[PDB]
């Protein structure tokens, strides 16, 4: 703890300059109670905890939204509606996490109506928190998306109040903002209406 502290206390913003430090922290055997990650946790303002269970669901970046915290998440700093939509997303996701065992055992068809409403909204905001990265387009091919803060605040406030219940779950997957989910839903409902006659071949017997 003193080795890590004597290192990490030199990475600060002083009154004469500023250091914005982003640090990757490996966790051994995907364990967060290991003493090196658990000691690194105290030295950071912002925390972004990436989970294997979220990467295996195809969500990328695989941030655990119920374990990644920050000190800037404070209504006296970022504003009241940003804090409200963040805490609403977190409450929807925690209420979904509380139902995972009873979704696994009894199934989806045994829940209440508010339960199978909040599960659907939680599955929409789980895919909507994912985002294609500009540096990750060389092994995926989908282009990257820089979202503005106002765009994601308004886009998540819409999903929280329920402006997009009719949209499918997979329309939120790997889109930038709340316009692109509508464009993806339109493009993917053209795909279930795309039927052609004779497959417009014109391949055989070309002219020279």
């Amino acid at each position: 703890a003193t080795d890590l502290g004597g290192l990490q206390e030199r990475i600060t913003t002083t009154t004469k300059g500023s250091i914005t430090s982003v640090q990757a922290v490996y966790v051994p055997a995907d364990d967060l109670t290991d003493p090196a990650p658990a000691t690194t946790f105290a030295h950071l303002d912002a925390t972004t905890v990436l989970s294997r269970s979220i990467a295996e669901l195809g969500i990328y970046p695989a941030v655990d939204p119920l374990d990644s915290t920050s000190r800037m998440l404070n209504p006296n700093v970022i504003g009241a509606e940003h804090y409200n939509v963040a805490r609403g997303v977190q409450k929807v996701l925690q209420d979904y996490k509380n139902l995972q065992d009873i979704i696994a055992i009894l199934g989806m068809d045994e829940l209440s109506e508010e339960d199978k409403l909040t599960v659907a909204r939680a599955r929409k905001i789980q895919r909507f928190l994912s985002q294609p990265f500009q540096v990750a387009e060389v092994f995926t091919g989908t282009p990257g998306k820089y979202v503005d803060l106002a765009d994601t605040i308004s886009g998540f406030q819409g999903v929280l109040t329920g402006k997009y219940d009719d949209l499918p779950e997979m329309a939120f997957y790997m889109v930038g903002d709340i316009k692109e989910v509508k464009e993806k839903a339109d493009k993917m409902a053209k795909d279930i209406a795309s039927r052609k006659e004779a497959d417009n071949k014109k391949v055989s017997e070309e002219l020279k």
Binding site: T20, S21, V22, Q23, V27, T40, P61, S70, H82, V135
Partner: protein, 52 residues
């Protein structure tokens, strides 16, 4: 003061501080080098100062 990153989950649920210590936890291929490359690509080009 906030540091806008362009990442939706980061800007919404754990917003980064301009001049604050940021950690990216996760183990063995969950994406904490792609996330730090995207943070370089998004933040460092729109910064002005120097990087290490």
């Amino acid at each position: 003061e906030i540091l806008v990153t362009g990442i939706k989950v980061v800007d919404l649920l754990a917003p980064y501080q301009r001049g604050g210590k940021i950690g990216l936890f996760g183990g063995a291929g969950v994406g904490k080098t792609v996330l730090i490359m995207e943070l370089i690509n998004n933040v460092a080009k729109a910064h002005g100062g120097f990087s290490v």
